Amino acid sequence: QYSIEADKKFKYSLKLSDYPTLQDAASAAVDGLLIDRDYNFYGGETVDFGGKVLTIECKAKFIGDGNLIFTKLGKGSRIAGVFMESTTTPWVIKPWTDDNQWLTDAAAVVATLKQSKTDGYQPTVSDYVKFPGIETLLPPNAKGQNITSTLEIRECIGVEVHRASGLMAGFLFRGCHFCKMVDANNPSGGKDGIITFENLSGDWGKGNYVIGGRTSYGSVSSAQFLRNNGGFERDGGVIGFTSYRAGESGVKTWQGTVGSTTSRNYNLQFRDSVVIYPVWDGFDLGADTDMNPELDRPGDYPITQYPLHQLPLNHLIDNLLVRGALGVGFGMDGKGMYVSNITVEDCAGSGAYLLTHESVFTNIAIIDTNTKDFQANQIYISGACRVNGLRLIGIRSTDGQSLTIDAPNSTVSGITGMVDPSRINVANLAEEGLGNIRANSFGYDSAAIKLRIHKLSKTLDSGALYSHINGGAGSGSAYTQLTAISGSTPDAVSLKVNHKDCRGAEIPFVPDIASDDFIKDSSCFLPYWENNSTSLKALVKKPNGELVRLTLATL
Amino acid sequence: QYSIEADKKFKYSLKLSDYPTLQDAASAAVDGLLIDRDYNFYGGETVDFGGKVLTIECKAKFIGDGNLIFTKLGKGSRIAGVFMESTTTPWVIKPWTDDNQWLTDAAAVVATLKQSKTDGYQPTVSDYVKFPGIETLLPPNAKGQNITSTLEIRECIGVEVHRASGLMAGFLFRGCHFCKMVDANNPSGGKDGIITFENLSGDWGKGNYVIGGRTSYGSVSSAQFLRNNGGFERDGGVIGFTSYRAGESGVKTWQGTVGSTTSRNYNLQFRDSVVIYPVWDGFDLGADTDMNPELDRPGDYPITQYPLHQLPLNHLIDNLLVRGALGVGFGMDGKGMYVSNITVEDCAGSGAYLLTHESVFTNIAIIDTNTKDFQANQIYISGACRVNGLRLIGIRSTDGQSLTIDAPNSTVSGITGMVDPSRINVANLAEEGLGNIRANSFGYDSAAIKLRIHKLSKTLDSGALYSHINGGAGSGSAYTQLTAISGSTPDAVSLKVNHKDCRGAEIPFVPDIASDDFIKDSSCFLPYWENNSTSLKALVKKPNGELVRLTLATL
Amino acid sequence: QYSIEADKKFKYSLKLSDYPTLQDAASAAVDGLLIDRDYNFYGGETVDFGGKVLTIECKAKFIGDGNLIFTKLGKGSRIAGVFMESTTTPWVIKPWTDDNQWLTDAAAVVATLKQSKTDGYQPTVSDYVKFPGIETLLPPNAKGQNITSTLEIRECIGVEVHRASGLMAGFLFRGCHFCKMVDANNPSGGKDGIITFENLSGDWGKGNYVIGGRTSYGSVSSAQFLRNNGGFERDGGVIGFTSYRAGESGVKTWQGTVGSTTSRNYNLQFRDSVVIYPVWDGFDLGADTDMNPELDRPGDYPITQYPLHQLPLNHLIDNLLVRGALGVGFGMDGKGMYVSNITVEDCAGSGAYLLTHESVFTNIAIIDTNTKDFQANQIYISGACRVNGLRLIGIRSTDGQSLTIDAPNSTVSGITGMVDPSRINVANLAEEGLGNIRANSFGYDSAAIKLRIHKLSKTLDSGALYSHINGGAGSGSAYTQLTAISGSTPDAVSLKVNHKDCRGAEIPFVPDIASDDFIKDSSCFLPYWENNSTSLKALVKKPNGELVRLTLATL
Ligand SMILES: [Ca+2]
After folding, report:
1. Beta bridge partners of C154
2. Rounded to whole angstroms, how far apart are CA atoms A289 and B142?
3. Which of A2, C203, C470, C538 can bridge C550 by disulfide, Cβ–Cβ 3.0-4.6 Å?
């Protein structure tokens, strides 16, 4: 009698402590499943949840190298608090100092080696490129390691993993749809990506998100996607996420062919997220391979339809922050893209590397990047793009000859910052829509409005409008000067108004007999010097266009 | 004995499968209530939860056309995972192509008709305006449909609905306070608004939020408010939300009278949210009716106190993104408003439609909008407002004569982008606080600093300061030119410095006898031509202000 | 037999109603603990949770003045829905009007006194400074009150408090690590800080966050940190948070010595958050004491290593909004800082007060601040910093002489807004990287490009390039004018091109005999007046640099 009442009035949950294997618990579960004791799993251990909609509450660890594979969870299933930990304590490198300066010297990086499940990462082949010479210097026991404790959700729909954490930990959603990794509680990564949505088989992934939370370390990228397409609804991607110290990149959409098909991604959101101190890049949102690319795209659009780097990727990209990359802050490719509100600070390589065409970039800030001169420039754009608002330069100087922006096919407006103008290369730069203007000068005895024709010279101003103090401060007097370059000497030739408060115009004249072709316009005169009589002459182009030579000033 | 122990140590939850009706389960529930089987409800089915603080966990569907009404939930009650689904599969339209281009032709829209619970929406009367002629062309079976499966929370305080989803689904909070719709899991909408806080009766709504999540489709607006006032504490609104493909608008505060009282809203937050591909508008934050307005405001401030469009709405509006609207990206009205950090891209109608007065807009970006020329301009502001930072123009051209910004009573500073200056209309445009300036020119043999007096001509520059190459690249030589318009020919009259590297000033003279009134200032001279003697003359205004005519240059 | 089955298949939870004290329930709990009845606690009541990982679900109140202390919760424990309420109803002040105008007059503030647990705050000693004279005017029963109902989590790791609320409520994490205050459900504060992470004893705090949610009222700061260091991983801080009407500041990192050691903080995130209507400041992110500072830093870096205000605080600060402060919107100190995307509106004191050195500020907007002239300026920067993008001025005027920006050691670029240029003081202001420029003028018969040398005069332009209409609108004619200041009269001396459509240049001449030193450059001439013969003369500096005087124009 009581049993009838009790079966109706109490919440169903079983606990793993009461079962000899995880499958035994899974098979018996109805609603709740509590992980209340640490569970040692073998790599490839596979649990069949019978299509049941389960709420898996974790208050202990899953311990093992390799993958713990969950299958046949019903839509609406949730896994909370999971903690993955490897059995192996690998050798890790820590390529930064106790003052958070990046180490770049291979020998210094090797000297950091320790056995730990955190506070660094296992070297991989990409480290051989990142730290040149390290391949030879690393001891064999620190090369080729492959330690990750991975929770794999396999071929499920509508499963969410919440508040996950771990040590040498990874989370893989393989062949899943409408799944989410929510509020990741700072798992410390292993050899593989920390959060992966991989859909190389089956239908293109859709509805797969990283929402909130953060990760640390890992040998490769923190959050990554293969063969996902969010549809026009943009149903997938990364929102509200933080990546710290990825061994590769913070957020990565894969490029090129993986196995026999495309790993590329379309129609995802990348918004409201932060990547700090990646060893490679902050955001890597390209789809085509840059160096030595495939000649085809099996499973994707052919090269005949869209050239390399010109896929209609159509991601929704907004409100991203990157700081401290040892590689590139923000990288992408594609055609027809809109990108907005990107802030990149203090990166050793380019702040932005944009292999894009017919794309628009709005309100971009690239602040103290390429600080180790790893790339040619701070921001590169290959194709014919538009940039509307670009902040350049924080507090760092540049000693060498590298460009700040090289966007040779792009049209740009709204640069702010103490950029060295010789380090700008664009197709067209303009402020078409300014109002009435004032140039305010501080810390000088003059104010200047300068002109520079980059075709003539990228390094020398070709003319200027100046105002210069006469006397000293408080004099109530200045002179205005209109200048032109000659013989590569800026300001060589000039007209002045009010020099020494004289209230007159000082007019330059041709220092010898003027040639006919020196005068440009009709109804104008050009003064010139006749030294043989101590006279000024005037070459006059009359209103009718004919030339005459007159005497202008005499002894 | 065991029963005493068990009653104390187990969590209380009952499951709907054990009860014949939802009311029977509600009446028996203590703490938890599990929806473990699909439940078919009749429209208007009303459940009385006895004031109990319940945690309702949904792992199955509520199925029915019409409203499932929950009442008398205690403060702190939570409903998670709810899934609403209609019994009717209606006719829906899908006014976009397989390349995500909007369809605007009525006949093309009619051709998209299919029976589905998603992937489109049921036509409503607003479609008759949006797609002109469609009212005549739609078959009768596709007109006037009214399918929604709505969870209605009625007259409750402190109830939260989390992770809701569905098909033809809606969520209505009627007469509620301190309620939230949290992390909406992409419900696909029906005929009515997807998320509604309606407080037409009782106290003004307060504490009501949409937090996080997203919605898709629906015939009308995704998230909407009637008669809510967040108080000075700004306790309500929309934060962190995404709307896709609203049949009307993404986020809407209602305007005008509904029933017998005001539907307007005050003191709400609209922040950190995204609206993509609405059929009408991204954000519709107006309170007064634009076309054919009421002559009064029953239940609100009278017109005598605040004129139409001048209510002190006082919303907190920041960090919003809109892309792809078929209507207006961002619309509002009100007086005394501050708005910041708004980004609008790729809209067919105006990017921003601002019926505002004595309001401030900071860091606005309106990028490639009014692309179908549906409105007069890309950004319109009616009243006397201030705009501080305005990015205009992405990559699209404008073939016709429409203005980009028409803000005739507004003062604006900080435009960036390749705007056509003839398409700017403002009360005042200025950059008062620039430093020393350099104009850098790429892709031309000259650099230019131009002036345009819009009262004189909106299409022609009235004067310029140029620098032009002498010779070719690398010559180290340029000439500076100061010009003025005459006879509507820009640059008609000019003074040059260093033309052809001559190191002299070429000075324009009056091509005939100068009239007395041609000279402006004392202690100045004006050269002019005397053709009858092949002489230059000078009209001199002496230091004492009197005129004299002198001979300046002779044969 | 049934008991064996039941013990395995039901979720364990006990409820406080079944136990005489909270400790009795804690001791018996296994998994869940339900707070189902209001519980009156005594101040200092301490509960030992036995290291157990518990899920504490609150559906009733903890009632008491003083602290309810939770200890020995296991990592992964969660407390949801907690509601703290005092037993005392104190006297509170409400220093704002029914139109949300701040009250500043002490007598007016005293007149607001009422007994309530909300809608105002208990006066503290800081109010004596904020409202001068109020110390004398407050009745003794409204002074020195100390009412807070505080949930204290003591020396725990990995505990999260979710959806907390209350009246006169506070939340203290003392000596905790890896703890979070998540989705605070608008608790109304008491005398102490609403959310505090205090780590004065033990290891520096790390992993401690406020994530999401909001608070209202309180006598002091809403969210605050003492002796936390997030490490290079930036593992702690405030993300996604809203503070309303703090009695002191919205978000505060403490400064100086507290007790015997440092209260300072390093390496925290402050992002994506909003502070509205604080009585003092929006964000107070300083570490050193401004007024009457300590001569040392026990427990921290010594002054010999880092001077006052020059600590390497290294916080990650981005995407913050402040509106309506009665004090300062955004304040900080430190050296080597990067700060981005800060928006401050409508503050009575300075929008930003930056005691920083060698720091970079990118995309800052300070809009209508120092509105009550409480400080010297709207934005102050003490040290040698860089500002890249600064929006100034909304719609408010300034009647007095206060500066807008005073950043005397800083280099700034990219100011936008209707700033009064006389109210800018910086070390250097420049736009180095503009393209070809157009100045568009509306509402005037002229367009202007002005120059101002602040060393000469902060209030008068020293020269200008103008374009002015000849005739009226549509004439197709303008004149260009190049001017210079003399005798503190702007535009006193000028050269014109095309005045009255004459097609000639009007040239100013020296109104008397020119002195030798009036001419600057070789191969130039300077016209001057010889009144005794009604002649223009020319002072000529020949190509060889020697002077000669010629006759230029004669009767
Ligand atoms: Ca002469």
Report:
1. C71, C174
2. 48
3. C538
Q: Which of A505, A528, A533 is nearest to A517 (CA)?
A: A528
CA distance B31 to B168: 30
Nearest CA in chain B to C7: B6
Tokens of A25: 């618990």
Domain range list for chain A = 1-555
Alpha helices in B67-170 (DSSP H): 106-111, 125-130, 134-137
Say if residues A442 and C427 touch (Cβ distance below 8 Å). yes
Q: How far is C465 from chain B (nearest CA, A)?
A: 9
* Partner B contacted by A502 (CB < 8 A): no
Measured torsion, CA atoms of residues A432, A433, A436, A442, in degrees rounded to the nearest 10 = -70
User: Could you tell me if B494 and B466 are in contact, meaning their C-beta atoms sit under 8 angstroms apart?
Assistant: no
Q: Which two tokens stand for residue C536?
A: 């223009």
Chains that touch B (3 or more CB pairs under 8 A): A, C
Q: Does C433 touch chain B (CB under 8 A)?
A: yes
Tokens for C512, please give them: 């008397």
Cβ neighbours, 10 Å, residue B30: 15
Of A518, C437, A484, A497, the C-alpha closest to B480 is A484
Token code pair at residue C231? 């490490």
- CA-to-CA distance for C410 and C322, rounded, in angstroms? 23
Q: Output the CA–CA distances (angstroms, integers) from residue C10 to B10, B534, C6, in the order listed.
A: 6, 115, 6
Contact C81, C59 (CB under 8 A): yes
- Residue of chain C nearest A272, judged by CA positions: C272
Total residues found in chain C within this entry: 555
CATH 2.160.20.20 fits A1-555, yes or no: yes
Phi then psi dihedrals of residue C138, to 5 deg: -65, 135
Q: How many CB atoms lie within 10 A of CB A210?
A: 29
Q: How far apart are CA B5 and CA C24, in angstroms?
A: 15
Q: Is B208 on the interface with C (CB under 8 A)?
A: no
Q: Which of B490, B498, C451 is nearest to A462 (CA)?
A: B498
By three-state DSSP, how is residue B423 classified? Answer: helix
Resolution (A): 1.5
Chain C contacts of A536, Cβ < 8 Å? 525, 538, 540, 550, 552
Cβ burial of B99 (10 Å; 0-12, 13-18, 19+) is: exposed
Q: Which of A245, A148, A244 is CA-nearest to residue A193?
A: A148
Helix (H) or strand (E) holding B61: strand B61-63
Beta bridge partners of C35: C58
**How many other CB atoms sit within 10 Å of the CB of residue C372?**
13
Whole-number Å distance, alpha carbon A539 to ligand 1 midpoint, is 13
Give catalytic status of residue C192 as yes or no. Answer: no
- Find, among B269, A447, A241, the residue nearest to C429 by Cα: A447
Q: Which residues of A273-286 are buried (b: 16+ CB within 10 A; e: fewer)?
A: bbbbbbbbbbbbbb
CA A168 to chain centre: 27
- Which experimental approach was used here? X-ray
Contact C551 A552 (CB under 8 A): no
Residues of B in contact with C527 (CB under 8 A): 525
> Does residue C10 sit in helix, strand or coil?
strand
Q: Give me the residue label for tokens 């000068």.
A: A441
For residues A186 and A157, the answer to whether their CB atoms sit within 8 Å is: no
Separation between Cα atoms, residue C312 and residue C289, nearest integer Å: 15
| Residue A532 backbone class (left: φ over 0; alpha: ψ -120 to 50; beta: rest) | alpha
Cβ atoms C452, A439 nearer than 8 A: yes
Beta strands A91-92 and A114-115, pairing class: antiparallel
CA distances from C350 to A174, A310, A458, C279, C347 (A): 53, 48, 41, 13, 7
Please tell me if residue A517 touches chain B, with a CB cutoff of 8 Å. yes
**Lookup: tokens for A26:** 């899974």
What is the C-alpha to C-alpha distance for residues B29 and B70, in angstroms, rounded to an integer? 14
